[PDB]
Design a protein around this ligand. Structure first.
Ligand SMILES: C[C@H](O)CNc1nc(Oc2ccc(F)cc2F)nc2[nH]nc(-c3ccccc3Cl)c12
Length: 339
């Protein structure tokens, strides 16, 4: 039942959207495409519309388009960005060239912003429990992909999705777990818990926890706080080069977190000590952290949902452009809006 589309030149490209979406206005860059704010006249919601940039340009692009669509279609949680709508002006698979994604328009990210800290981190962990239960890892959680509305209600964006933008004194690398940053090992879900620790610390102090000037300076800032690796962790580092470099470092003990986070709620300090553990096997999980005394005022086990199973078998699959495009098209066509 095809809606009527109209055309409008915005982000140096012609946007072609259903009539329901009015007053389009550029917000900026999103993940793999440009974003416009819009009023959805059907739902009464202020929405963000993302037009993907050349979504089937290559195999890597076609697969990444499929991947983002699948991830967004899966996520049905208050604290996680999901899909309100997806459309294409194309009438068939043959003319399918553009994908538009629609979600809630948020008010500010965590850059643009103790009881407040409890509430914000609670929601991140609530959302992360849900994402992690589906065997999804965010991989790049940072204040800029965490957004709030007016009531400080939070959603996580850009989950599940280069060398130069990770280089130097840049916020793009400051929230990354040491094992990802230096590619130590095949990493788990608590890389995101490391990120939550970095963000929580920053909300509490108003300062970046590990503002490294490069990968190596950042590692040193990390190890000064949490200590140098012991034998047990060194064994778990499969990268022989990386393991060898670690062993060149002067050994350092873990610092006292109460002397770093002076004046902070001791339950906040305790939680930070459990999130910011060097060995990712021993880091607190999202489900465990929600039960921590710090969130006593917000914690409700009956209101902390988990996700339906997420089939990501497509990830290990190699297909042609036209095959990823066809799969993408099927997912667009089969979309059913939320209530
Ligand atoms: C962080 C990101 O790379 C840029 N900001 C935003 N991006 C997106 O991307 C989309 C994701 C899924 C969709 F279905 C549609 C989108 F536009 N939605 C958004 N909805 N609201 C925002 C937003 C708006 C103003 C300030 C902060 C944010 Cl996160 C926002």
């Amino acid at each position: 039942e095809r809606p009527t589309f109209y055309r409008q030149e915005l982000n140096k490209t012609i946007w072609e959207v259903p009539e329901r979406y009015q007053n389009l206005s550029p917000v900026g860059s999103g993940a793999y495409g440009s974003v416009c704010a819009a009023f959805d006249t059907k739902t009464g919601l202020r929405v963000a519309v993302k037009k993907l940039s050349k979504p089937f340009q290559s195999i890597i692009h076609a697969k990444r388009t499929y991947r983002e669509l699948r991830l967004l279609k899966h996520m049905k949680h208050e604290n996680v960005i999901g899909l309100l709508d997806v459309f294409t002006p194309a009438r068939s698979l043959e003319e399918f060239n553009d994908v538009y994604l629609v979600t809630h328009l948020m008010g500010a990210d965590l850059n643009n912003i103790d009881d407040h800290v409890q509430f914000l981190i609670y929601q991140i962990l609530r959302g992360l429990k849900y994402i992690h239960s589906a065997d999804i890892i965010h991989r790049d959680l940072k204040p800029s992909n965490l957004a709030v509305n007016e009531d400080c209600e939070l959603k996580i964006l850009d989950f599940g999705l280069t060398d130069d933008e990770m280089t130097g004194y840049v916020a793009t690398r400051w929230y990354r777990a040491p094992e990802i940053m230096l590619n130590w090992m095949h990493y788990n879900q608590t890389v995101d818990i490391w990120s939550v620790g970095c963000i929580m610390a920053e909300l509490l102090t108003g300062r970046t926890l590990f503002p490294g000037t490069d990968h190596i300076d950042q590692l040193k800032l990390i190890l000064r706080l949490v200590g140098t690796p012991g034998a047990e962790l060194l064994k778990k580092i499969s990268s022989e080069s990386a393991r060898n470099y670690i062993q060149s470092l002067t050994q350092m003990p873990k610092m006292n977190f109460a002397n770093v986070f002076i004046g902070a709620n001791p339950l906040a300090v305790d939680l930070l000590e459990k999130m910011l553990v060097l060995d990712s096997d021993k880091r607190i999980t999202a489900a465990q952290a929600l039960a921590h005394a710090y969130f006593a005022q917000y914690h409700d086990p009956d209101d902390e949902p988990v996700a339906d199973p997420y089939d990501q078998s497509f990830e290990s699959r190699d297909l042609l452009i036209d095959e990823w495009k066809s799969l993408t098209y099927d997912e667009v066509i089969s979309f059913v809006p939320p209530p």
